[PDB]
Structure formats: structure tokens, C-alpha cells
Amino acid sequence: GQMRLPSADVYRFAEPDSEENIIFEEGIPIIKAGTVIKLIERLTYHMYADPNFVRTFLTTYRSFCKPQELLSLIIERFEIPEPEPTEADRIAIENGDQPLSAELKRFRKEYIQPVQLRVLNVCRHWVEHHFYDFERDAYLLQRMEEFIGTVRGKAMKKWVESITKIIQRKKIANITFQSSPPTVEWHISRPGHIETFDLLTLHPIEIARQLTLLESDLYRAVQPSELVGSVWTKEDKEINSPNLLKMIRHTTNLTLWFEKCIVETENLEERVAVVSRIIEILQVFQELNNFNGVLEVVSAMNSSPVYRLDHTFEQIPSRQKKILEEAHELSEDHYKKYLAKLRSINPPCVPFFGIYLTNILKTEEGNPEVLKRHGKELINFSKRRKVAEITGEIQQYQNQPYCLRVESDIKRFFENLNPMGNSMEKEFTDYLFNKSLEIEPRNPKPLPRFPKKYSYPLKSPGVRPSNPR
Amino acid sequence: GMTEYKLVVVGAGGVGKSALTIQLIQNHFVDEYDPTIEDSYRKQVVIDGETCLLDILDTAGQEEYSAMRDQYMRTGEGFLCVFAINNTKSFEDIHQYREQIKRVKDSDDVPMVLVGNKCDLAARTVESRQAQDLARSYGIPYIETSAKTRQGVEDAFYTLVREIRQH
Amino acid sequence: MTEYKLVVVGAGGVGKSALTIQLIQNHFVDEYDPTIEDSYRKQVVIDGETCLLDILDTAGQEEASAMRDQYMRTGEGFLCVFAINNTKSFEDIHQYREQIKRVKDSDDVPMVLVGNKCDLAARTVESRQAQDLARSYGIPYIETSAKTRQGVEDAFYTLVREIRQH
Ligand SMILES: Cc1cc(Cn2c(N3CC4(CNC4)C3)nc3c(N4CCN(C)CC4)cc(Cl)cc32)cc(C)c1F
Ligand SMILES: Nc1nc2c(ncn2[C@@H]2O[C@H](COP(=O)(O)OP(=O)(O)NP(=O)(O)O)[C@@H](O)[C@H]2O)c(=O)[nH]1
Numbered sequence: 174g175q176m177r178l179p180s181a182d183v184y185r186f187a188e189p190d191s192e193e194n195i196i197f198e199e200g201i202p203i204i205k206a207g208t209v210i211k212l213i214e215r216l217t218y219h220m221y222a223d224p225n226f227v228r229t230f231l232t233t234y235r236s237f238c239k240p241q242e243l244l245s246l247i248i249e250r251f252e253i254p255e256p257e258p259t260e261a262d263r264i265a266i267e268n269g270d271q272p273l274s275a276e277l278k279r280f281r282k283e284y285i286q287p288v289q290l291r292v293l294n295v296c297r298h299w300v301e302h303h304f305y306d307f308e309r310d311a312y313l314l315q316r317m318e319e320f321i322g323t324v325r326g327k328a329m330k331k332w333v334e335s336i337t338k339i340i341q342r343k344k345i346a347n348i349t350f351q352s353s354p355p356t357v358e359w360h361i362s363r364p365g366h367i368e369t370f371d372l373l374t375l376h377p378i379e380i381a382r383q384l385t386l387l388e389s390d391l392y393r394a395v396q397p398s399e400l401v402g403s404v405w406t407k408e409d410k411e412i413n414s415p416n417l418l419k420m421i422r423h424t425t426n427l428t429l430w431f432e433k434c435i436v437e438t439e440n441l442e443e444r445v446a447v448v449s450r451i452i453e454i455l456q457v458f459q460e461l462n463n464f465n466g467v468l469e470v471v472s473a474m475n476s477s478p479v480y481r482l483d484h485t486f487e488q489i490p491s492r493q494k495k496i497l498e499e500a501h502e503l504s505e506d507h508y509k510k511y512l513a514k515l516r517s518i519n520p521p522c523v524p525f526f527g528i529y530l531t532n533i534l535k536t537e538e539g540n541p542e543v544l545k546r547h548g549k550e551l552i553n554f555s556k557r558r559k560v561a562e563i564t565g566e567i568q569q570y571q572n573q574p575y576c577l578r579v580e581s582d583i584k585r586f587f588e589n590l591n592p593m594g595n596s597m598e599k600e601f602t603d604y605l606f607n608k609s610l611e612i613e614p615r616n617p618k619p620l621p622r623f624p625k626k627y628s629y630p631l632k633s634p635g636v637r638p639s640n641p642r
Numbered sequence: 643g644m645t646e647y648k649l650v651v652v653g654a655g656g657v658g659k660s661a662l663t664i665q666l667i668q669n670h671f672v673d674e675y676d677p678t679i680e681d682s683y684r685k686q687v688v689i690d691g692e693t694c695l696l697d698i699l700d701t702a703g704q705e706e707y708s709a710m711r712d713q714y715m716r717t718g719e720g721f722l723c724v725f726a727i728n729n730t731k732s733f734e735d736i737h738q739y740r741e742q743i744k745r746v747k748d749s750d751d752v753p754m755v756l757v758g759n760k761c762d763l764a765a766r767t768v769e770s771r772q773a774q775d776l777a778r779s780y781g782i783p784y785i786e787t788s789a790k791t792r793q794g795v796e797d798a799f800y801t802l803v804r805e806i807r808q809h
Numbered sequence: 810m811t812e813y814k815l816v817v818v819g820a821g822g823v824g825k826s827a828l829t830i831q832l833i834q835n836h837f838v839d840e841y842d843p844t845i846e847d848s849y850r851k852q853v854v855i856d857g858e859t860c861l862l863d864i865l866d867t868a869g870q871e872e873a874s875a876m877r878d879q880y881m882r883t884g885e886g887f888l889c890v891f892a893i894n895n896t897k898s899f900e901d902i903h904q905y906r907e908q909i910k911r912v913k914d915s916d917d918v919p920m921v922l923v924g925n926k927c928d929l930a931a932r933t934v935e936s937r938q939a940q941d942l943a944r945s946y947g948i949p950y951i952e953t954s955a956k957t958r959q960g961v962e963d964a965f966y967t968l969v970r971e972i973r974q975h
């Protein structure tokens with residue numbers, strides 16, 4: 174038979190499942206909705222582990238349960254009463270014999286030990302992967318330390334001692350590759366001469382590599398705490414989503430820098446060389462699976478100041494037009510080809526984050542927090558699962574590092590790029606558009622001529638890499 | 643076959659803009675959504691007896707990607723310019739959205755509607771007269787919508803389609 | 810994209826978690842933090858076909874030994890890991906192999922035998938003994954080091970191929 178359970182009046186997590194407290198989706202069950210007690214029971218269920226569910230729950234639970242209350246509930250879950258001796262045990266004891274205690278031993282082995290170990294696994298995942306709760310509430314950390322540090326008894330001892338050490342390490346807080354990274358490539362600007370660094374003087378391969386390393390690091394730094402609750406859209410976004418906003422501001426700055434390089438090159442022949450170099454950088458971003466970089470270039474080439482430059486357009490080689498077309502095609506039909514390409518490549522890659530942001534926001538806005546059933550409010554867990562599917566996808570592409578060498582000066586040049594200067598966004602983007610009108614006036618105004626501004630050769634070194642011994 | 647209209651929603655973030663397209667496209671009557679499913683943003687509708695397909699682009703949540711606005715707007719034939727009626731700054735932002743649409747489309751007469759969205763019970767700070775006056779100064783319709791009851795939502799999109807048809 | 814459910818099993822301390830984290834993050838973990846159950850995902854192109862690996866990293870400590878049926882039911886292939894400087898961990902392999910066969914009620918479950926810590930000079934399990942055992946199971950034997958990455962991709966991606974050809 175099934176094991177008997179403690180009475181639901183001394184132990185709240187033994188109440189029978191009903192549609193008043195848990196609803197499953199249509200080989201382990203998937204939860205649609207439930208009370209917080211039932212979600213915590215299934216989070217730590219005696220019959221199976223559900224590591225997906227642990228991550229989903231710890232990523233999303235603050236929309237329905239405070240951290241202090243979660244800790245109280247899982248300590249309550251952990252404190253399981255043992256059953257009293259059975260009739261056969263009693264008869265043995267009355268005869269001065271040792272009881273077999275078969276039902277007690279089975280309950281310990283098949284209920285208490287799995288539930289308790291799964292509570293500790295929740296604690297371990299909470300500390301390892303969602304430590305911000307404890308950074309933000311020192312008293313929560315004290316309670317966790319005290320709980321773990323007073324669990325008695327040998328079946329849990331190895332994990333209790335380990336989790337104690339993990340916590341102490343997290344309070345005060347190296348890559349190996351299959352191959353060597355390729356040699357850093359140089360063009361007109363030479364190593365150490367940062368004052369000459371610019372779009373046409375750095376090697377286009379190395380511009381793309383160093384921007385990919387920067388953008389990959391910015392992508393990898395975004396944690397789920399910056400995303401759940403749609404907090405990057407709210408009034409406290411700078412406090413709650415700083416790595417995400419740093420990532421987006423870098424993308425915005427690079428797109429505006431590409432536009433600025435184009436429209437501030439007033440000579441037509443030089444501006445064609447600028448546009449061609451930007452499309453070569455795009456080609457290397459495609460080769461590196463840096464889709465953030467791809468879309469940064471596409472966004473600049475489709476911007477109002479650049480799009481209208483028909484005289485520049487006319488001189489770009491059809492092969493480069495084809496590269497730009499295939500990059501823009503990734504974005505068409507609501508990113509249909511981008512989504513398929515992301516799912517087909519071999520990482521490392523740098524995803525475009527904006528799609529994830531829209532899908533998280535619309536999932537949170539378009540589904541209710543609770544479902545009402547039989548007079549009860551149940552937490553709508555399916556909504557949280559959908560959000561955590563997106564955060565899990567993000568994290569899956571954050572794991573793989575690029576096998577590319579950092580060039581610290583080129584890195585700093587792009588970190589410090591500031592095309593707008595002290596101007597506000599509206600006045601800067603009006604400036605770019607007026608610059609476009611100056612260098613290629615609207616018909617029927619004649620096209621002026623302008624002097625060259627670059628004293629160095631405009632010929633690209635190309636985007637196929639070199640390899641000396 | 644039937645005409646497809648490419649509609650783009652623009653407006654400030656953080657103030658419930660996404661409820662307009664979600665409520666349209668939804669199972670009107672089941673309050674649920676998966677935005678990741680293929681054609682959660684396509685809807686066949688009948689407007690003045692003529693069937694058409696609406697393809698709606700709403701990049702809600704990507705507002706900080708401000709240098710992508712042209713890339714996204716360039717896809718569109720008509721625009722819903724949305725502000726929240728309890729957020730005066732979002733209303734003040736409308737002028738610049740409209741200027742950027744005119745610039746991307748290279749036209750002074752782009753099909754567009756002004757939409758004032760009620761996204762919560764917080765006190766209104768933009769009165770309907772202020773928004774009507776703004777819309778009238780632009781020569782475009784003004785529709786108010788609720789983010790919770792679906793009121794106004796079909797009127798906002800259908801009015802925009804009529805602006806496209808009558809352009 | 811086909812999805813593959815891989816499960817990493819074996820005695821405590823043999824390096825299941827370090828192998829998994831080397832595969833997922835290219836990082837070697839020096840700490841010995843005993844696992845309860847962890848899961849990882851990895852998109853990767855293997856033999857020209859993109860797939861999605863779901864990797865379950867299980868508990869080797871004997872105190873968790875009553876909790877295995879539940880993960881063995883779900884897994885589609887198993888890395889059976891011992892450490893080449895730990896003869897007890899090699900003797901424990903057959904217990905894992907027999908349990909997997911019972912739970913899945915099958916004599917033909919995709920498996921790879923993995924001899925880990927092959928960066929260490931002081932070996933106590935010879936390659937021949939492990940290879941004989943692998944042949945008796947019908948499965949490949951791959952020696953690995955989570956520390957240096959030697960063999961790590963080979964072990965996991967050979968298991969994917971096992972599942973693909975099953
Ligand atoms: C200075 C300059 C500007 C541009 C702007 N541009 C255009 N031009 C057509 C045009 C000539 N008179 C209008 C401007 N079409 C573009 C495009 N589409 C995507 C959809 N496909 C079906 C057609 C191509 C995508 C992108 Cl991202 C940029 C596009 C392009 C280049 C190479 C250039 F050197
Ligand atoms: N030299 C060397 N040490 C290794 C190797 N793999 C693991 N280790 C070390 O062995 C110890 C145990 O590793 P770990 O991955 O935690 O083992 P596990 O099999 O997951 N243990 P458990 O079953 O308790 O979860 C750690 O100190 C780790 O650094 C390896 O290939 N070489």
C-alpha cells in the first residue's frame with residue numbers, strides 16, 4: 174500500500190490533492206496552478222525530483238511569495254513528524270523484544286529522507302544561483318545559515334556541511350579551450366597607438382572580434398533578477414536591471430556610432446568606403462554568430478539618416494548589398510529566420526536580447542497572477558513556467574565562451590565610445606538627419622562635392638584572417 | 643486574396659502599452675497569452691464588411707533600444723501612437739514619435755491614430771480634452787482604451803485601418 | 810533540433826559534476842560540493858545536426874542511493890563514470906548498470922563507460938580492465954579529465970550518437 178502520512182493538522186503538506194488546491198496540465202505531472210503549500214510540496218516531492226521545477230520556482234516565486242515566507246515554508250516542510258509504533262512493534266516491546274519498526278523505517282527511507290534532501294537541494298540552488306535575495310536582506314541570510322547549521326543527524330550531514338561552506342564562500346565572492354585563439358589582426362593603427370584608432374584604421378576583423386567579446390560579456394552578465402517582474406521597464410529600472418541596461422546602451426551607442434561615421438564622412442567616395450567597411454564588419458559578426466552585432470549594423474543601415482543616401486547606395490557592390498539583405502532578412506516576419514538560425518548554430522553566439530524582453534513582458538502582462546477555482550485563488554504557475562522557459566533559454570546561451578583573445582586597448586576604445594558626446598538624444602539624432610540632408614540634399618537640389626577628410630589609404634584589408642607562423 | 647495591413651504600435655514603456663495588442667489578439671474571452679507562438683500577432687478581421695488580415699508589430703519592452711526605432715517603424719503602413727492617461731511624460735513623448743514616423747516614412751501624412759490607454763486605477767493626469775486637442779492639431783483620430791476591460795481596443799485598430807483605406 | 814536526455818551517474822567524488830561543468834562552461838571546479846540533483850542544457854552541433862542536450866547530474870553519495878529510479882526512468886542515455894585512481898568507484902559501476910537495466914526494463918540502454926581523472930599519474934584501474942567491462946556491456950570506454958578537458962566532448966557526444974542510433 175502507499176505509505177501513511179502525518180495528519181494534515183500537524184503537518185500541512187499532507188493535505189490530499191484536490192482541484193481546490195492544485196490543478197495539473199493535461200512522465201511527471203506538470204502543474205498549471207496551485208496554492209503555495211501545494212507548489213512547495215511538489216517542489217520537494219517524495220516520489221521524484223524535478224530540477225526544472227526548482228529552477229522555475231526559484232526564478233519566479235517572488236511574484237507570489239516573499240523570500241522570508243518561502244524560507245519559513247521550506248523549514249516547515251523539512252520538519253516531518255515520524256509515525257508512532259505499530260501494533261506489531263507494540264507487541265514486540267511488550268515482550269521485551271526489539272521491534273522491527275518496518276513502517277517507520279520505510280517512512281524514513283521513502284518519505285522523510287527524500288523530502289528533506291529535496292528541501293536542502295532547494296536551499297543549495299537558492300544560495301548558488303539566486304543569492305541576490307540574501308545580498309538584499311541580511312536577516313534572510315542569517316536565518317538560512319541558522320537553519321542549515323542546526324540540521325542534525327547523519328543522513329543529511331554531508332550536504333549540510335557542504336551548504337554551510339557554499340554560503341560562506343558566496344558571502345565573500347577560469348576558462349580552458351579545445352584550441353588556441355587566432356592571432357590579433359592589425360591594419361593602419363598599430364599596437365599601443367590608441368590615439369589613431371577609428372573605424373577605418375583598426376582591422377575590420379579585429380573590430381568585429383573585440384566588439385563580439387564585449388557584447389558577449391555584456392550578454393553573459395544579465396541575471397534573471399533583472400528580468401522577472403518586468404522590472405527593466407519600471408521606475409526603478411536603473412537599480413534593478415543595471416547589466417541589462419548597460420548592454421542595451423552599448424548596442425545603441427554602436428548603432429549611433431556607425432550612423433555618425435557614415436554621415437560625418439561628407440566626401441562621397443570616402444563615405445562609400447565607410448559603408449563598405451561597416452558591411453565587412455557585419456560579415457564577420459555573422460561568422461561569429463554575434464547576432465546583437467548583426468542587428469546593430471542593420472539598425473544603422475535602415476536608420477533615417479543612412480537609408481536615404483541614394484548616391485552612396487549606388488556605389489556599394491552587389492555582393493555587399495546581398496550580405497546586408499540576408500542580415501535584414503533575419504528580422505523579417507517577426508524575426509522568423511533569426512529565431513531558426515539561433516536554434517541551428519553551434520555556440521558561442523550573442524543573441525539579440527530585445528525579443529526575449531518583449532516575450533517576457535507580454536507573458537507577464539497577458540496572463541493572470543491567479544486562477545479562481547471553486548471559490549479559491551490558486552497561483553497561476555503556468556505563467557511563471559513560461560517566463561522561466563525564456564530565462565532558461567537566455568542562460569543556455571550564456572554558458573559558452575568565445576575563443577578570442579582580448580586586445581585591452583581596442584576593448585577600451587569601444588567601451589569608451591560616446592558618439593552623442595554631451596548632446597541629448599533628440600538633438601543628436603536631428604543632427605545626424607540634418608547631416609544626411611547636407612551631404613545628399615533632397616531632389617531637385619544639386620549634389621554638392623566635399624573634400625576628403627582621411628589622409629590614409631581607404632582600401633580594406635578584407636575580412637579573411639591571416640596566419641603567420 | 644485579402645489585404646494585409648502592417649500596423650506598428652509605438653509609445654513610452656512601463657505604462658501598459660502591450661495590453662492593447664494582447665487584448666485585441668487574445669482569445670478575446672480567455673485571459674491568456676503565449677507571445678512566442680507563430681502568429682500571436684496576426685488576426686483576420688472584418689472591417690466595414692471587408693475581410694482583411696492585421697499583422698501587428700508591438701515591440702513593448704524594447705524601448706531602451708532607441709536606435710532601432712527606425713528599423714522597426716520602417717516595416718509599418720499605419721501607426722498606433724499610445725500614451726498612458728496617468729503618465730503625462732508619455733503624452734509629451736508623442737510629438738517626437740510622430741516626427742520620427744514622418745521621417746522614416748518620408749511623408750507628412752502617414753496613417754496614424756492617437757491612443758490614450760487607461761492601464762490602472764491610479765489618477766488620470768491627461769484629460770481627454772487635452773488629448774483630443776493634440777489629435778486635432780495633427781489631423782488624426784483619438785481613441786481611448788482600457789487595459790483591463792477591452793473597451794476601445796477594436797475601435798483603435800479599426801479606426802487605423804480606415805485611415806489607411808482612406809489615405 | 811532533437812532533444813537528448815543524458816544522465817551522469819557513478820560513485821561520489823568521481824567527477825560527474827566537474828565533467829558536466831567543463832562541458833557546459835569550459836571551467837574546472839576544484840571544490841568537492843556533493844550533488845543532490847542538478848540539470849543543465851546545451852545546444853550543440855554533433856555530426857552536422859544541431860541538438861539540445863538536457864544533462865542530469867546525479868548524486869553519488871550513498872545516502873541518496875534510494876532515490877535513483879526516478880531519474881533513471883526519464884533518462885535516454887547514461888554516462889557511467891568512475892575515477893581511474895579509485896578502484897571502489899570502478900567496482901560500483903556494475904551496480905549502476907544493473908539498476909538502469911532493471912528500471913528501464915531493457916538490456917539495450919544507450920551508455921558510455923567513462924574513466925575520469927586521467928590527468929592523474931597514480932592510476933589504480935588499468936585501461937584494459939575497464940575496456941573489458943565495456944565490451945561485456947556492448948558500449949564504448951572513454952577516458953576523460955574534467956581538469957584538462959581531455960576526452961570530455963568525446964564522452965558526451967559519443968553518448969548522443971548511441972541514443973541517435975538506438
Ligand atoms: C547608404 C545605404 C543605404 C541602404 C539602405 N537600405 C536600402 N536601400 C534601398 C534604397 C536605395 N533607394 C532606397 C536604400 N534597402 C535596405 C534594406 N532592404 C531590406 C528589404 N529588402 C527587400 C531590400 C533591402 C535593408 C537595409 Cl538594413 C538597409 C537598406 C543600403 C545600402 C547598401 C547603403 F549603402
Ligand atoms: N585531477 C582531477 N580532479 C578531478 C577531476 N574531476 C573531478 N575532480 C575533483 O574531484 C572532486 C570531486 O568532483 P565532483 O565533480 O564534485 O565529483 P562528483 O562525482 O560530482 N561528486 P558527487 O557524487 O558527491 O556529486 C573535486 O575536488 C574535483 O575538483 C579530474 O578529471 N581530474
Ligand SMILES: [Mg+2]
Binds near residue numbers: 826827842844867869
Ligand atoms: Mg556532483
Ligand code: NA
Binds near residue numbers: 729
Ligand atoms: Na503624470
